[PDB]
Design a protein around this ligand. Structure first.
Ligand code: PY1
Length: 301
C-alpha cells in the first residue's frame, strides 16, 4: 500500500550502495532508497536496524517504511524515509560555510544523535545499544532547521545486553577506510566487546567535527572544505595507506592555531583531540560530548 502509492520524482544522490530518489507520498516529499538486487545483502539489514529498535530521535533519520516490491517483472526493494532537501552534511559543508552558531548546532545534533544510537535502555520496551561503524560526513544529513540526523545505518551493530552478545550484520563490506579508527586500521580492535565499536564511532565523529569547524567562518576567515587526511592520503585510500598515517606516523588532522581565538572553536578543538586518542578507552563518550556542546549552546543562545 506504501511503495505502491509513492511516485518517484528525482535522483537525490548515489550511495556506493543503491542510490536515492526524492518521491511524493500523499502530497509530501519523501526519500526512497532502492536496492540494486545484489545489494539486498543490506536491504533487510538496514530495514531491520531502522525497525527492530526503538530508534525514534530527532537526530536520526526518521524511518517511514520497507516494502518488498520485487516486481512481477523485476527486483524492487524499497526503503522509505523522511526527505531532507539540503542532503548530506558533506554536500552542505562543500557548498556553504557556517556561523559559530551553525557549527555548534551541527556538532551538537550529531552528538545527541549518536548518543541516542549508543544508549541502551534495558527492560520491557527497551532499546539495544547501537554502534554505526560507518560514521562520516556523507552519512549524516542536515535538516531544514540547521540540525543533523544520522543516516545510512546499514552497517550498524546491535548489542544484546541480556546475553552480552552482538547481533552481527549480514554483509560483505566493512566501512569507509578514511574514517576507520586506529584499532580498526591495525586490526587490534576486540570486535567481541561492544564498547570498542562505540569508541570507534567516536574517533570518526571527531573527524566530522574537524570538517565542520574548518567551515565556521568568522571575520570572513575559514578554510576550504576538505576531507580528513586530504593532505596525507589519496582519494579512496587503502587500509595500508591509512594505517601508516594514522597508526605508524601517529598523525591526526591539523588543528589551526587560530581555532583558539574563539571559545566555541576552542571547545570543538578540545573535543576533537579527545576523540582521536589511539586508545579508545581514553576517548570522550557521545553523551559527554553532547553535554559540553549543550552547555556551550545555551551560553551562545
Ligand atoms: C531511505 C531513503 C533515503 C535514505 C538515505 N540514505 N542516505 C541518505 C539518505 C537520505 C535520507 C533523507 N533525505 C535525503 C535527502 C537528500 C539526500 C539523501 C537523503 N535511506 C533510507
Amino acid at each position: 500500500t506504501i511503495a505502491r502509492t509513492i511516485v518517484l520524482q528525482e535522483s537525490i544522490g548515489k550511495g556506493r550502495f543503491g542510490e536515492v530518489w526524492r518521491g511524493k507520498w500523499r502530497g509530501e516529499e519523501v526519500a526512497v532508497k532502492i536496492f540494486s538486487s545484489r545489494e539486498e545483502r543490506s536491504w533487510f539489514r538496514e530495514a531491520e536496524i531502522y525497525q527492530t529498535v526503538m530508534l525514534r530521535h530527532e537526530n536520526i533519520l526518521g524511518f517511514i517504511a520497507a516494502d518488498n516490491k520485487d516486481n512481477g517483472t523485476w527486483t524492487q526493494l524499497w526503503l522509505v524515509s523522511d526527505y531532507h532537501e539540503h542532503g548530506s552534511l558533506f554536500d552542505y559543508l562543500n557548498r556553504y560555510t557556517v556561523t559559530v552558531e551553525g557549527m555548534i548546532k551541527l556538532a551538537l545534533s550529531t552528538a545527541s544523535g549518536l548518543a541516542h544510537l549508543h544508549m541502551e535502555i534495558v527492560g520491557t520496551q527497551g532499546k539495544p545499544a547501537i554502534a554505526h561503524r560507518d560514521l562520516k560526513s556523507k552519512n549524516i544529513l542536515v535538516k531544514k532547521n540547521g540540525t543533523c540526523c544520522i543516516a545510512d545505518l546499514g552497517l550498524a551493530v546491535r548489542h544484546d545486553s541480556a546475553t552480552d552478545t552482538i547481533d552481527i550484520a549480514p554483509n560483505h563490506r566493512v566501512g569507509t577506510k578514511r574514517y576507520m579508527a586506529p584499532e580498526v586500521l591495525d586490526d587490534s580492535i576486540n570486535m567481541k566487546h561492544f564498547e570498542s565499536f562505540k569508541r570507534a564511532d567516536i574517533y570518526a565523529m571527531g573527524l566530522v567535527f574537524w570538517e565542520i569547524a574548518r567551515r565556521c567562518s568568522i571575520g570572513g576567515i575559514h578554510e576550504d572544505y576538505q576531507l580528513p587526511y586530504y593532505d596525507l592520503v589519496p582519494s579512496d585510500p587503502s587500509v595500508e595507506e591509512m594505517r601508516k598515517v594514522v597508526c605508524e606516523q601517529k598523525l591526526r588532522p591539523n588543528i589551526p592555531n587560530r581555532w583558539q581565538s574563539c571559545e566555541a572553536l576552542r571547545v570543538m578543538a578540545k573535543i576533537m583531540r579527545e576523540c582521536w586518542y589511539a586508545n579508545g578507552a581514553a576517548r570522550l563518550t557521545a553523551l559527554r560530548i553532547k553535554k559540553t556542546l549543550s552547555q556551550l549552546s545555551q551560553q551562545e543562545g
